């Protein structure tokens, strides 16, 4: 009988605290980079304003697809620890070198004298690519920062977690990772604010932005070394579940064969449907609700007063959703928690689009509440936007990562990479393409409200169906693997 502190075994505690610290450090770096990259690529000595859109449209998704293909073969030819280090150490060393060498020597490595010769060579329509060349370093930083948030946060960390955590411990401790994730976001936001202020408070004659960037990248590399040390500690001094002996399988090593299996797998299909539908739903409904919001509050002061209260409610809901998620995971299981998000989004979206499309009929009904139907739509969309963003680290991400645990390591790792790197940017891109198609069809997103609502209905319906099928397959895998382990161990 090993000792138990706080009602939890010391071994599980010893495996969970370093995981929580790793996730804290990872999201600390993620927030620092997510702010540094956009405050950096625009405040560059020579930088077009169409340099970030080009990196969001034509660079982000191809880079994600290329990283998926690279990671598949790397996992095929490397062990778990070797792959983790091979993926994360380049990020850490690049951010350190950028903070200490590449940014101070930015006038030296940037080909300003070449991407004006080639700008007289290639017409102004090619202003896009030329711009990146002109500040390639910073642009690479941007890309790498994006990749960090797409890879180190999702593939690296959560792959490690699903590799070392069982389904029971995942139900017990994944919401408590989101609590701590939010603390990392809070503290990293305060750190970014502190260094933004420090850039100005320090006296003249000093490149305050250079000092702030050096300090922020020093924190980035410190947290990265902390992540590496915690990974080494968990892999050395924590007894990890080995697997069920079904672990043996022919290594595919076919980047065509592996992808063909992933597209033909009914499990990855449903999981990718969840991810894609989540991204599309929040993006579309967020745009529509913000348009209605602007219509509601014409004055600046009222708009900002409402977006103080919205943030306060967002924080309160984040806290209460963390607690409620740790409760529902303990009590009802994976299926209920996986279906809570699409059902609530569906109900709130139906109410929202009903108050939008039919405001006339609903005017007497909402008048009982003392609200203009526009204001009712604003509040419904605000509550939906709150539930959808507060259930990420509490309700959606825990379910998504725990769906990976009962899989075999081949499919686990490969589907993790192919979903959390490629399918999520595809969700965002599909939402954008959907809205653009509605615009080109009907001239405006205001003239496409019924069709936007109908396609959102279809998307969340497919989300619910995928959640149901995924929960069925998830229970099937869990039962099969537990019975197989108990039969081979008997």
């Amino acid at each position, epitope marked *: 009988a090993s000792p138990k502190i706080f009602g939890v075994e010391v071994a599980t505690l010893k495996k969970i605290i370093p995981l929580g610290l790793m996730f804290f450090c990872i999201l600390f770096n993620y927030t620092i980079l997510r702010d540094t990259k*956009d*405050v950096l690529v625009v405040t560059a000595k020579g930088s077009s*304003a*169409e340099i970030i*859109p080009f990196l969001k449209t034509w660079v982000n998704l191809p880079m994600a697809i290329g990283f998926m293909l690279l990671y598949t073969k790397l996992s095929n030819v490397l062990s778990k620890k070797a792959l983790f280090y091979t993926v994360i150490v380049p990020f850490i060393i690049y951010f350190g070198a950028f903070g200490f060498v590449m940014y101070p020597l930015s006038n030296y490595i940037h080909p300003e004298a070449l991407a004006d010769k080639l700008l007289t060579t290639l017409g102004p329509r090619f202003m896009g690519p030329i711009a990146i060349l002109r500040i390639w370093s910073f642009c690479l930083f941007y890309v790498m920062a994006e990749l960090w948030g797409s890879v180190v946060v999702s593939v690296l960390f959560w792959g490690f977690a699903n590799q070392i955590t069982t389904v029971d411990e995942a139900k017990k401790f994944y919401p408590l990772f989101g609590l701590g994730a939010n603390v990392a976001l809070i503290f990293s936001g305060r750190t*970014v*604010k502190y260094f933004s202020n420090l850039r100005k408070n320090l006296g003249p004659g000093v490149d305050g932005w250079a000092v702030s960037l050096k300090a922020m990248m020093s924190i980035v590399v410190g947290m990265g070394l902390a992540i590496c040390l915690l990974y080494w500690w968990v892999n050395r001094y924590v007894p990890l579940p080995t697997r069920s002996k079904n672990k043996k399988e022919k290594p595919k090593m076919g980047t065509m064969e592996s992808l063909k299996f992933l597209v033909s797998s009914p499990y990855i299909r449903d999981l990718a449907t969840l991810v894609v539908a989540y991204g599309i739903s929040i993006n579309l409904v967020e745009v529509t609700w*913000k348009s209605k919001l602007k219509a509601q509050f014409p004055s*600046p002061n009222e*708009y900002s007063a409402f977006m103080g209260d919205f943030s306060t409610c967002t924080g309160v809901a984040t806290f209460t959703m963390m607690l409620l998620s740790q409760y529902v995971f303990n009590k009802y299981g994976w299926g209920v928690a996986a279906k809570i998000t699409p059902t609530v989004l569906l109900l709130t979206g139906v109410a929202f689009f009903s108050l939008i499309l039919f405001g006339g009929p609903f005017a007497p009904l909402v008048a009982k509440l003392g609200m203009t139907p526009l204001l009712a739509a604003v509040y419904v969309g605000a509550l939906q936007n709150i539930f959808s963003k507060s259930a990420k680290y509490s309700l959606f991400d825990p379910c998504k990562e725990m769906a990976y645990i009962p899989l075999d390591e081949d499919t686990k790792v490969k589907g993790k990479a192919a979903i959390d790197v490629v399918c999520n940017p595809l969700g965002k891109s599909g939402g954008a393409l959907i809205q653009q198609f509605m615009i080109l069809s009907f001239g405006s997103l205001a003239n496409s409200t019924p069709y936007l609502g109908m396609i959102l209905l279809v998307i969340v319906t497919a989300w619910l169906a995928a959640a149901k099928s995924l929960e069925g397959q998830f229970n099937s895998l869990r039962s099969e693997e537990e019975l197989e382990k108990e039969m081979e161990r008997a």
Partner: nanobody
Amino acid sequence: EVQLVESGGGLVQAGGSLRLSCAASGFPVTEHEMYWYRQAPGKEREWVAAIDSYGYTEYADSVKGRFTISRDNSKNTVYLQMNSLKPEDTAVYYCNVKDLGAWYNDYDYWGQGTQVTVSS
């Protein structure tokens, strides 16, 4: 810091055209939603037209069908074309940016405004 400068406001006859231009600096102007407000003397500041990071161009009903907001990423500036102007469009027009992130301290940045007067 964040800098927003408006231009193009002037004196035009009723039924005329006028193109406001907000030049922005110190933040990604293509990644945040840019607003256009107007304020008349004796009245509160009211919203005119916004454009999102995607360029989706939501307008106020008072100017819908006549005004056209358009962000040019090549020149890094937001634009507000005003066709079929009418004498109650006379006001000081401001371009606004909100919620710029943790690197910024105010949550609201405005230009100094540009005067648009429409003569009857």
